[PDB]
């Protein structure tokens, strides 16, 4: 298995970016570096063979990208002077022996912006199902909305009762811009979770939507009043809801009130008992 | 005419000391052009011909790394084949492997070979149509099934037809001065009386390349398939070959006998008679 | 030099059987590789076909190779067999230092058999934390375009397929949301051609107390408190009987 690192990169325009292509399960003889702009097909960038010097392509401009095949299991791409036009999806493949197939590792989303005052953490909200839906079809659909984040490096997940859930969840394949035309626009993402009617309206169930956001690194100069948008997790929670009917909460309140009142009445009765028995004893003694 | 490229791998197990000894050699026609010996200190794939030294470092690095992988595969094969045949650990056993390709006059693919042998007897081979295997004994049936379930004959067929021929044409053009040459045999015949009556006439053949030659003895058109002795063709150490054929005859009938030599370098087969 | 993959885009019904194919012309073919790529991940290796004639077969996919072209058979696709299917060829070279030749791809989209339709539009409750208004269009016939809103301040996402393994239920859905006071979404999906007999719920609310009482469960504390209530009742009854007996003895 070939694995890259890092998997998400953001940088101010003017610095260098370094991506690695550690190869596992064999000793790779050939390592290929590709590139994929959004909504377009794969384009090969460069090839490194054995331990010689890399062979570049027609439109790769050697002085920009550097490749260093140091070991037999480690290639290292380096973009020297990052520019906002170099915001793409970099993939790396490796093969052992010139006759076997190559293996691709996980890509690496790179986004370069010329100002760090454009990174914004997402805002997440959760919307509960409508009772008309529950009456009509006996199912509930919670909706999670994450809006207003830049870049589009986020990962959304659904947690029920502290456990991640996989069935009944549908998420958009890719984030979509708020204003499609204008530059520097934010992004929106929506997720839907569908549940049986009985499961939703049991107030003992806890639902949570989580969005993991990869942003500014730990050492980046921040000269703005607002918070520094670092990698974080934004959640939105909800409790099961039974709007009309008898639930456990009502029964518990009734039991507590009954306990208090019965204890009061028993105390009063045992107060009366002492007095009546004392007067019984006095009346018997006076005989 | 035709040409060929061959690769021979041999591995011998030493049950008491060290790792098994592995030796690999490669031939173009009858010229060895590369070697690898595990006991040598270099531990590298080494050249053996002048025209093969033009290759770059990547070539030698790849060849070394892959032939070492070949050796490891042979070691594991020895380990397993000891198990299949139920033999002790204290013996010494050998595995041999050969593969290669042939090309015709127009430098197109003609045929390809892949064969295994354990302790000097055939174990498993790739048929002449390069699609199905041939196993001799029962112990090879398991390997045949395992290889037939993973399409191994077609990973090998892809190499034997394409890349072997590519490499062979590459070498044939790199070393055209020596590989495509042809030498005529320098033929002469000598006489030796044995004691007093019989005599030996011996027709020689010196310094000819390639190694394929034919020598015959005739008596006024009679083919002497018997009463003649010819030795195996032997190398001369400089890339040429030698041979000779001798016949014993009664004295005074030397002119009745003649020696015919035919080689690829002779436009017309020769005929030698005493003096 | 010449590797063309067709059709450029496909669209299937769940349970059909289709086949893609990749045509190539090279003097070469050291190998032929089939890959599969998700929208935002690295390609997943599927097949290698070294020679012409043989055929591989994974769980549902199948691949063949001939002298002129290769075929990828898909039998009974599921709605998760949606990706880009890529074809690559490696031409012969004495040294293998010659780059591959990549086909452009083929977008495969598998639509569900949603059985009986039941289109509807529901206005979802507010989140009490944001001012956005959201509603949801669900369970249409799976052949229905969802067109973007001409309004600039209303966002509508594309149709999406949802699977419930707890009740093996497949459905389609879309979400429309905006921040505006007059946004009642009886008109939000105007720009799209919604089907007929689409259900628009009444503004009132309905109740089924039986359904709410189906989802009831307890724990230990409720049991203990009920037991305590029972014990207090018994003790009070006994003491009240004693007190009544005393007040009748005396009077």
């Amino acid at each position: 298995v070939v694995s890259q690192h890092p998997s998400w990169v953001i940088c101010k325009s003017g610095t260098s970016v370094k991506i690695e292509c550690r190869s596992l399960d064999f000793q790779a003889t050939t390592m290929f570096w590709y590139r994929q702009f959004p909504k377009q097909s794969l384009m090969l960038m460069a090839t490194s063979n054995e331990g010689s010097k890399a062979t570049y392509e027609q439109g790769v401009e050697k002085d920009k990208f550097l490749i260093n095949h140091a070991s037999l299991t480690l290639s290292t791409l380096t973009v020297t002077s990052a520019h906002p036009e170099d915001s793409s999806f970099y993939i790396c493949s490796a093969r052992e022996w010139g006759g076997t197939e190559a293996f691709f590792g996980q890509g690496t989303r790179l986004t370069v912006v010329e100002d760090l005052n454009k990174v914004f953490p997402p805002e997440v909200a959760v919307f509960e199902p409508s009772e008309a839906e529950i009456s009509h079809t006996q199912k509930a659909t919670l909706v999670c909305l994450a809006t207003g984040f830049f870049p589009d490096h986020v990962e959304l997940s659904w947690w029920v009762n502290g456990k991640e859930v996989h069935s009944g969840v549908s998420t958009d394949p890719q984030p979509l811009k708020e204003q499609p035309a204008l530059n520097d626009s934010r992004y929106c993402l929506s997720s839907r979770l569908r549940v049986s009617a009985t499961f939703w309206q049991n107030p003992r169930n806890h639902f949570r939507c989580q969005v993991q956001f990869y942003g500014l690194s730990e050492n980046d100069e921040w000269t703005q009043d607002r918070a520094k948008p670092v990698t974080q997790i934004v959640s939105a929670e909800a409790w099961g809801r039974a709007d009309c009917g008898f639930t456990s909460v009502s029964y518990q309140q009734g039991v507590l009130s009954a306990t208090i009142l019965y204890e009061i009445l028993l105390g009063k009765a045992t107060l009366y008992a002492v007095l009546v028995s004392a007067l019984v004893l006095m009346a018997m003694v006076k005989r | 005419g035709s040409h060929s490229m061959r690769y021979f791998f041999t591995s011998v197990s030493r049950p008491g000391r060290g790792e098994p000894r592995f030796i690999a050699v490669g031939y173009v026609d009858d010229t060895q052009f590369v070697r690898f010996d595990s006991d040598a200190a270099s531990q590298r794939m080494e050249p053996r011909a002048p025209w093969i030294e033009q290759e770059g470092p990547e070539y030698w690095d790849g060849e070394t790394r892959k032939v070492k992988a070949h050796s490891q595969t042979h070691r594991v094969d020895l380990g397993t084949l000891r198990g299949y045949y139920n033999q002790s650990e204290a013996g010494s056993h050998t595995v041999q492997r050969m593969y290669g390709c042939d090309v015709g006059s127009d430098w197109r693919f003609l045929r390809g070979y892949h064969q295994y042998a354990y302790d000097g007897k055939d174990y498993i081979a790739l048929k002449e149509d390069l699609r199905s295997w041939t196993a001799a004994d029962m112990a090879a049936q398991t390997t045949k099934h395992k290889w037939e379930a993973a399409h191994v004959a077609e990973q090998l067929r892809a190499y034997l037809e394409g890349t072997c021929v590519e490499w062979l044409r590459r070498y044939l053009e790199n070393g055209k001065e020596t590989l495509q040459r042809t030498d005529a045999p320098k033929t002469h015949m000598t006489h030796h009386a044995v004691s007093d009556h019989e005599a030996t006439l011996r027709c020689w053949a010196l310094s000819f390349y390639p190694a394929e030659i034919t020598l015959t003895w005739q008596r006024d058109g009679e083919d002497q398939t018997q009463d003649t002795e010819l030795v195996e063709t032997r190398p001369a150490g400089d890339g040429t070959f030698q041979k000779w054929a001798a016949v014993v005859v009664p004295s005074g009938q030397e002119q009745r006998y003649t020696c015919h030599v035919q080689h690829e370098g002779l436009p017309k087969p020769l005929t030698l008679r005493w003096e | 030099d010449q590797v063309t993959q067709s059709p450029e885009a496909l669209r299937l019904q769940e349970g059909e059987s289709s086949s893609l194919n990749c045509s190539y012309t090279v003097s070469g073919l050291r190998g032929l590789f089939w890959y599969r790529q998700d929208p935002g991940k690295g390609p997943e290796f599927l097949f290698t076909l070294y020679s012409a004639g043989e055929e591989k077969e994974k769980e549902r996919l199948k691949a063949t190779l001939t002298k002129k072209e290769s075929f990828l058979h898909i039998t009974a696709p599921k709605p998760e067999d949606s990706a880009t299917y890529l074809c690559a060829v490696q031409p012969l070279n004495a040294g293998n230092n010659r780059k591959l030749i990549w086909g452009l791809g083929t977008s495969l989209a598998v639509n569900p058999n949603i059985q009986n339709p039941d289109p509807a539009v529901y206005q979802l409750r507010d989140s009490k934390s944001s001012d956005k208004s959201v509603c949801l269009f669900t369970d249409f016939d799976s052949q229905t375009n969802v067109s973007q809103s001409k309004d600039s301040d209303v966002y509508i996402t594309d149709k999406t397929v949802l699977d419930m393994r707890s009740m093996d239920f497949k459905s389609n859905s879309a979400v429309a949301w905006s921040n505006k006071s007059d946004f009642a979404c009886a008109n939000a999906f105007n720009n799209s051609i919604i089907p007929e007999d689409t259900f628009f719920p009444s503004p009132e609310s309905s109740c089924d107390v039986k359904l709410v009482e189906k989802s009831f469960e307890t724990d230990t504390n409720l049991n203990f408190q009920n037991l305590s209530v029972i014990g207090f009742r018994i003790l009070l009854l006994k003491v009240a009987g004693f007190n009544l007996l005393m007040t009748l003895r005396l009077w």
Binding site: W97, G98, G99, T100 | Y7, G26, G62, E63, K66, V67, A69, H70, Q72, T73, V76, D77, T80, L81, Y99, Y116, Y123, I124, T143, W147, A150, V152, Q155, L156, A158, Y159, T163, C164, E166, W167 | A94, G95, N96
Partner: peptide, 10 residues
């Protein structure tokens, strides 16, 4: 050029 493929054992 030695065989450049995948090693298969007996």
């Amino acid at each position: 050029g030695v065989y450049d493929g995948r090693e298969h054992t007996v």
